[model samples]
Target chain A: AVSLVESGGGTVEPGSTLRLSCAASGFTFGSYAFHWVRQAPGDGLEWVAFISYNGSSKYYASFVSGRFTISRDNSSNTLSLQMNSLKASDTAVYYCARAPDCADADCHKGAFGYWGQGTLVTVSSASTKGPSVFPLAPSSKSGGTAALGCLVKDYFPEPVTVSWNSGALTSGVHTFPAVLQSSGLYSLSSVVTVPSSSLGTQTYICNVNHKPSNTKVDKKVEP
Target chain B: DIEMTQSPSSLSASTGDKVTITCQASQDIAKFLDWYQQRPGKTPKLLIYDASNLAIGVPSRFTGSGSGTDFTFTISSLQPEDIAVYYCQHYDDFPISFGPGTKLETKRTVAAPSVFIFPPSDEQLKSGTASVVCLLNNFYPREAKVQWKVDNALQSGNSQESVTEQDSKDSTYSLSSTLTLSKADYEKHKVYACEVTHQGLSSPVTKSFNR
Candidate 1:
């Protein structure tokens, strides 16, 4: 249930200073080691930096070299990878990985048992596109129900949003929250239950409400 | 500040051989170096730190001795489990750097071959073609050789059985190899056999049939 975050997406200026941070939750802040890695297109995985829980950090990075700095905030339990004086080569996806448990043999070098998905940062200006919807797998929570869903994936412009609409019912109906995806986009599953015979017909719609409430694409669903 | 790079990148050697893995820094790092070993699915363990001091529980054979830019991690007598990638870390600067990685290799034992399930003889040997699976069980380490030979011809393809795996309950391992005999190589009275070779075995444990 541990996830990563770099809310801002898409691109950055060529000479910008990018501070990419991801925090770990569900466990003690300083209980595990943290490692950062970067991957460039048409390139291999580059070891960025690493730290054991005892606060001893090591680096194998020559690409980022002295340009980037890695640090941890015990207050927020967040790991920060700060980069300065960037270039086109710095355009790649970054990841903050959780190392093996700090328990004895489990605590060793470069062994990443858990890893945050990825935080992609670009050094050039790029376009921002919304997500496309996929088929939904309906599930039952409790008793009587009929649910229709909208599944979205692989779209760009992080921190995306989804809005739902239905004609079948209201007040009794529940609209869920949007989820941030690992692909640096957003994914959502919305279910409007037409409660058996008691809960009548309801058509729900998921909208691609762009930034500032600009509804770009809308797919209407019926349950 | 100095940079470090490992040599050869990979290696292959016997279990008892002496392994001397080297890490050369770009400049003088003084005596501020550490060596680590990483096996598959395991964390990287520190073999040496502070240039020459071994981490606690590290075997006496894992001796670290060097200064400045040049450091050496010498294993007096490598064990089967010593096959892993070794890395050197430097603490000379704010961003302590690590060497690329030098792979340490040594021969390891695999559990010998044994027949887990055999149908004795299937009807396909006469009419047409099918696959007969030989489940090899209880292996040590990971690598093993499960070979299929139809008399003078030998078979070494990936598909004679499912993946070779270690047992969960008893902590042993098993492998699967298949002997594919069709009208291609089956011309009446073929002496087909499954030969299993392990690092500890002086000879292959073979199970054969005549059809």
Candidate 2:
């Protein structure tokens, strides 16, 4: 049972329909279910809907049912969501996730651990390119120990890796433990220690690896 | 499956004034809250959550606060070009929900102001030493990109940048970005502009400065 991942980005005019694809690999057809989630910049998570490999569907009650649709092509193992009557609000990082095979009595409760690198679909009256990022974070330390915390909400499927670095802790020497949390929604914390003697004006990083959405938060610890 | 209702639908304000938008949930949602902004046809950018913690790159002037069934989105020191619609959403439920949105417009009641540009005098271009700055404002999810164009053509050496927020009022907020270039590059270019592309805004806005 292998898992597949795929994603794409495109542009659409306002009031038109936009369809996105999330292709999967390493699994048999008709054995898994696919779900769609939406996250805007710095926003919380929103479950759009889900589609069974067999073609069944479930959506949020508040959503305009007919306005949206979910489908998957078994041959391609690619899951797709089509949003209609597009508005600026419809623009977001749309992800395709999967649930464990449900043949077993204790199904995997439909949590999303895998993700497609996000696709930035732009909807406008005209065409434009997407946005980028820079590295920055606030930090503090005391008693020979330092703590760095970054707020990354709306990211799903747990197991985000956070890394710390210092002169003593040379690049590639830092190690992160395997994440231990539910595959559902949860926050992640990674802490690293440096000797008190090596603690003056040293830099540390809180890097999160959630493939397709890699982000690093750097903090400079002070005495 | 909860419904969110917003009020006033739209509003107008001037720089240094205050504005607010309310999001009433159909039921109690604890504190799983998120706010966002969407320009004409771009993607919705997230603003505040847990009601106060600002997302990285978000402005300080933008604030969010509320609990239970009622929530608010506020913006302080509204700029002239700060016109856009704002929304509130709940993450407490499986399928998230969003409020309609409140458009912030320039206040007509106040006397119209004139345009102002700084650096009264302009400088001459220096080869290979010029740069361009792009400001992507009032967008959510920060999913836009900015590019440097010279004489209507895209230039190389353009790199990624960061975003910052101003102070926050009730629940509203604002954000901006700055892109810099080399001194020589800045001097050779006749037109220096910033183009922003995002998911929600209808189209990107380009701002140019001459040397």
Compute each candidate's TM-score over C-alphas: 0.38, 0.36
Error of 2 at B89 (Å): 13
DockQ (Cα-based) for each candidate: 0.02, 0.04
Encode model 2's per-residue lDDT on B6-54: one tens digit a residue: 7777675667888777888889887777676766434445567665657
Runs of candidate 1 exceeding 4 Å displacement = A1-62, A65-71, A82-223, B107-211
What docking grade does candidate 2 earn?
incorrect
B1-211 per-residue lDDT for model 1 (tens digits): 4667887677766768888878898888888787777664343566687679777667899988899888888889878677777888775764556677886444344555444223222223344543444545455654577777666477655233333223333334455444445555556435666677776578877766554
TM match of model 1 to true structure? 0.38
C-alpha-based local distance difference test score of model 1 = 0.58
lDDT of 2 at A51: 70
Over 4 Å off, model 2: A100-108, A129-223, B2-211
Write the residue-wise lDDT of candidate 1 on A101-186 in tens digits: 34553354443445676777766433455555532322211244434445443344443555565243343222333333323343
